[PDB]
Amino acid sequence: HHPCCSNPCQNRGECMSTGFDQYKCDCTRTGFYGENCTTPEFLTRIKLLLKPTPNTVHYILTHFKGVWNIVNNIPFLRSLIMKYVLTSRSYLIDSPPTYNVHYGYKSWEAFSNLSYYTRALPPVADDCPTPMGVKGNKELPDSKEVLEKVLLRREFIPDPQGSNMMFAFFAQHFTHQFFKTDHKRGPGFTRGLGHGVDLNHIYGETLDRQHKLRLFKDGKLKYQVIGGEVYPPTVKDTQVEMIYPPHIPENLQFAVGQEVFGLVPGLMMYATIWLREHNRVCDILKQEHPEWGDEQLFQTSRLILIGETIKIVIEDYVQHLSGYHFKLKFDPELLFNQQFQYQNRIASEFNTLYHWHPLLPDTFNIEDQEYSFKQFLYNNSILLEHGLTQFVESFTRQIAGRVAGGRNVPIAVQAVAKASIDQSREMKYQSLNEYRKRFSLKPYTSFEELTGEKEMAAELKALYSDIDVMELYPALLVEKPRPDAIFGETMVELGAPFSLKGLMGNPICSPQYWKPSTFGGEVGFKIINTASIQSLICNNVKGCPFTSFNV
Amino acid sequence: HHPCCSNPCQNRGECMSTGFDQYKCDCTRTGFYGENCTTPEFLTRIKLLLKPTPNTVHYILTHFKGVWNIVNNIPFLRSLIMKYVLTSRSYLIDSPPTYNVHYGYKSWEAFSNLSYYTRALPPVADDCPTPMGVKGNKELPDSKEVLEKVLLRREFIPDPQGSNMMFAFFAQHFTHQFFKTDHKRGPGFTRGLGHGVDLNHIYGETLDRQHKLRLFKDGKLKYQVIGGEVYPPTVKDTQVEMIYPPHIPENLQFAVGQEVFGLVPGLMMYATIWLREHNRVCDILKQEHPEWGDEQLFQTSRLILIGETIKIVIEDYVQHLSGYHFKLKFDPELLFNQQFQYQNRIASEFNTLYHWHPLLPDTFNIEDQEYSFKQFLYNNSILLEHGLTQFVESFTRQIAGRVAGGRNVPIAVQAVAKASIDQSREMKYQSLNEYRKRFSLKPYTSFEELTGEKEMAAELKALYSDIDVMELYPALLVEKPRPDAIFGETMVELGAPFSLKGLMGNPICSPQYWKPSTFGGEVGFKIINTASIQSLICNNVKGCPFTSFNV
Ligand code: HEM
Ligand code: HEM
Ligand SMILES: *[C@@H]1O[C@H](CO)[C@@H](O[C@@H]2O[C@H](CO)[C@@H](O[C@H]3O[C@H](CO)[C@@H](O)[C@H](O)[C@@H]3O)[C@H](O)[C@H]2NC(C)=O)[C@H](O)[C@H]1NC(C)=O
Ligand SMILES: *[C@@H]1O[C@H](CO)[C@@H](O[C@@H]2O[C@H](CO)[C@@H](O)[C@H](O)[C@H]2NC(C)=O)[C@H](O)[C@H]1NC(C)=O
Ligand SMILES: *[C@@H]1O[C@H](CO)[C@@H](O[C@@H]2O[C@H](CO)[C@@H](O)[C@H](O)[C@H]2NC(C)=O)[C@H](O)[C@H]1NC(C)=O
Ligand SMILES: CCCCCCCCO[C@@H]1O[C@H](CO)[C@@H](O)[C@H](O)[C@H]1O
Ligand SMILES: CCCCCCCCO[C@@H]1O[C@H](CO)[C@@H](O)[C@H](O)[C@H]1O
């Protein structure tokens, strides 16, 4: 079998076979040397001595509110700290990208073929003696047994960080522009060839789709007006393909950039809000530029909404998730004197870790109604009946579920949780602890250390036998949360590098794009740099209801 | 008409309309301010005082051979200087890319759509009063008159730098992997979606083409043996499409990665040499890695040949062209402490400036034969008859034509030279002097200043009236050459940024790729770092004939 099956090289050293039964580790620029890249250079020894653990840094960031209150109000200091957050996180991501599901060695095919998700760790080779390499049993435990014993919800567990359904549906809407698995090809393939925040879930992945969604007047997107309210246009009107069951009324087959967004009314809620936002920005640019044509109005509005998106994701969405007293900043200028690649490739493991289905409540509570999953799915009538204003008021008030901590996946989506496990295995993912090492975390030494409790830990012990073959996805959902937090350590320390790299890697953040003229002047630039989740709702939802990502 | 038609903003500032007849310049990070970005900041003033002209620096690099001989032998100093050549040239290129033929403003369409060549300067807007904006006559001079008066060859003018036909066909073969215009769409469109040195001209642009060209044993490319010599396989054997006239017999339709390389036996000579090199490297890797399969052998050899290509282009090809006494270096490590983007988009203007057809001789002289263009084109019989050893010996001896200095386009390709002019206009290129300012050059103040003489200058004066509407492409070919040089100032100062950025921008030059394990270990790595045009010929051509890019 492959000599690298045991994953011998440490500290991001790379393993290469050098014969049928021999390997060599390439320790180049790891800060380590020796056969397995485990002997630290002098400087590396010193660095390791002084480095705080993630849990220590997390502590500091979530305490001393009074100090952070001062720090937040000193621009130079706030910039310094945000610059360090961006650079230190982004360093953990290979860019240009390297591995994918078919290539555990660098190749021009892996580099150039955008239909692959990339891989933060290479796949376990096909001929390895066990699923995780050489450790553990010949087969992993039955994925249904793992699902049922430690993932499925008994009683709803609320997010102690107070995340609401505005947050949950924003997470789903936002991420599904770059998590778009090409199931015809397999789980390691994506249909999101822009590999990031290009707003294809509003505008369409292809030019043909985009042009069917556009009005071709004033830069705007097509729309319909039902009961005096602006909604996306229909499938029949646009000839845009959408996923809908056969029984859906013609005028409820809303057509939007992302074909799956008819799945759930919470998605259609944001699709509608962003469509309105695009057309609003068109109106503003037309006022500013009476001389501009439709094409420039459309393109410049798209750039502005991309900037708005990144602004809101950092300063509202990630701010909320972080739990930090430090005030995050969206500021491309922070990187202009740093080394940083303005490109990104979406990682399979980023997709996996973002399967946050424990957020979902047992019912969807709008106004006085409590809808079941069966009532809520593919049902845009609910959106039309209550209206956007009521959707926002209700979802702002409704608490979402905790993601880490175990046993909180709604049984309505149990098949999704099982697929995340089955597809992880199909893509030959390395183990939880290999991923922890990859992101500078200490391997867990027991199941009880992983969960912080005894009962799930024992079920896991019996299923997996060795902590070193525990799987990434179920680990994320059973991991001991930070104190009163929605996530455990592995979720944040993997998620944050992927997230921030992906956000700042966008070309609009590069120096030649990050200028007023890119966005039609100071007016368009300011739309980006003053965007918030509250302003997005205030500008585009009748009555300007209050909103927030927390209850 | 468009308010920016006159190109009012200077020093890389960006022009935006602000009403039907007003404009605003965005001077962000130009080092200048004021209505047109022409007022220097203080630091800027100082820099402009200290900065030597391109002609001055060129003079320095091409004299003092004794001093350079010392510098070339001080590793530290060589590295310092080469590093500054790389960063200073690359800084001139927008990366991530910006404009293209359809977008004179930044847009997501222009950023994301890889079918476009990018544009170093935006197109002249469609409603401008004159072709170049507001200056000059309503129509540009007849391109047939420009061609005949100042471009077409009378007597053959040999290159004073002694470039040979090994050089001319290397330029053609190498560049035609990333200059591949998509004529179905138009001159501003490319079929080279890798936008760089990906060796698609050997391996094919698409995966389907690649797999038809591959043997699927030992990593190798398919081939045939003719008289004991290895040649590319045929179209019939591979089902790989090629462009050939109907009279070419089945046995002479060689199939290689680039569809057009059957056009000229000089291209097919390099196609054969590189095909042999791929299979040679496969043999080496297989010795080092008996445990490897065909796919990894194939992919690793491709990465090695990409490295060889960049190595040879810098240290042989560009070295020769430069005329410098300084010894250039291919060393990705020079950029590891620098700000640099490992990406590139091929510019239309890079394509245009590389139309180096004056290199071509009046006849192609192999052994004792002198082939006309009519006899040479599409004639792979010539290659089989003389063989590669004789091709190399003959092309190494045969001098190529001077490119700058006027009147040296071969009449056999007058239609190509006319097309370069006509297509530049179709793509709405800005004038020569706009491009000179874009690359930090002083505008020419007269046609005599451009040509360094009187006769051609007066013909151009009559044709164009105003030096500020002189076109880029014909100016390149009539420009006053550097002393005893193949090119004038504009060619080098535009060409060098595009070239070096494109070479170092390749992902194999990035830190996570530039490691021995990427290339199958130290033996694979050393193949890249010792590659040369002589070793390429020596290893793959019977008898190891001596070669170089000069006569
Ligand atoms: C009513 C709400 C939801 C339903 C019915 C639902 C259902 C599904 C289904 C059926 C899949 C396909 C999985 C497969 O078999 O391959 C999926 C994928 C996924 N879901 Fe959910 N989900 C919901 C909410 C959410 C939320 C709130 C998030 C938060 C981020 C989320 C994140 C994801 C991700 C990242 C994927 C992978 C997408 C891809 O690769 O294309 N989902 N979901
Ligand atoms: C016998 C030798 C050659 C012949 C017959 C030839 C002929 C042609 C022709 C017919 C075109 C297409 C022009 C059009 O778009 O209408 C072309 C394009 C071009 N040629 Fe040549 N040429 C030769 C040698 C060279 C050499 C030595 C170079 C050196 C750099 C060169 C550089 C180019 C470039 C860069 C293009 C544009 C390619 C593209 O846009 O796809 N050619 N040539
Ligand atoms: C990116 O990589 C994808 C995975 O390799 C690749 O998809 C694969 O494409 C090949 C070749 O086009 C398909 O194989 C085909 O060729 C044989 C002929 O011998 C047919 O019998 C097959 O049915 C098929 O037509 C694979 O089917 C396909 N694999 C998957 C999983 O989709 C993409 O083409 C690559 N993308 C680019 C842009 O290169
Ligand atoms: C490099 O790592 C390998 C593990 O992959 C080490 O070899 C193993 O060492 C353990 C105990 O240390 C033994 O139980 C195994 O039998 C060893 N495996 C093999 C294949 O020999 C190796 O010692 C490490 N090298 C260094 C220098 O620390
Ligand atoms: C990149 O841009 C070109 C130019 O617009 C696109 O080519 C057009 O495609 C549409 C349909 O998508 C056709 O109706 C046009 O005839 C095409 N025009 C030309 C000039 O080719 C191309 O599709 C775009 N590529 C991507 C991936 O979106
Ligand atoms: C007090 C907070 C100062 C800046 C906090 C940076 C937050 C992210 O810093 C992270 O800390 C981890 C553990 O030390 C490291 O492993 C990561 O590389 C680093 O990105
Ligand atoms: C020996 C001095 C170092 C060699 C010079 C680097 C080669 C390219 O130097 C060039 O010189 C031009 C004029 O100054 C500039 O306009 C270019 O931006 C710069 O790249």
Ligand SMILES: CCCCCCCCO[C@@H]1O[C@H](CO)[C@@H](O)[C@H](O)[C@H]1O
């Ligand atoms: C070596 C003699 C040629 C130099 C004369 C300059 C060319 C101007 O003459 C042109 O030459 C073209 C090519 O033959 C012809 O097709 C045109 O009909 C002719 O006008």
Ligand SMILES: CC(C)Cc1ccc([C@H](C)C(=O)O)cc1
């Ligand atoms: C977990 C990930 C998906 C979201 C996330 C959460 C926190 C952070 C902060 C700013 C950090 O970098 O520590 C970034 C991104």
Ligand SMILES: CC(C)Cc1ccc([C@H](C)C(=O)O)cc1
């Ligand atoms: C003109 C271009 C196509 C070729 C070329 C010529 C010279 C140089 C040197 C290294 C420089 O930067 O001055 C680079 C590239």
Ligand SMILES: *[C@@H]1O[C@H](CO)[C@@H](O)[C@H](O)[C@H]1NC(C)=O
């Ligand atoms: C769809 O929603 C409506 C309310 O708008 C509800 O009454 C109806 O029962 C739902 N449909 C299904 C199939 O549950």
Ligand SMILES: *[C@@H]1O[C@H](CO)[C@@H](O)[C@H](O)[C@H]1NC(C)=O
């Ligand atoms: C700026 O450009 C215009 C031409 O567009 C010119 O008239 C003006 O004098 C220039 N300089 C200043 C300082 O405005």
Ligand SMILES: *[C@@H]1O[C@H](CO)[C@@H](O)[C@H](O)[C@H]1NC(C)=O
């Ligand atoms: C092709 O070259 C051969 C020499 O190998 C020559 O005899 C023949 O005439 C040429 N063909 C044409 C059509 O010129």
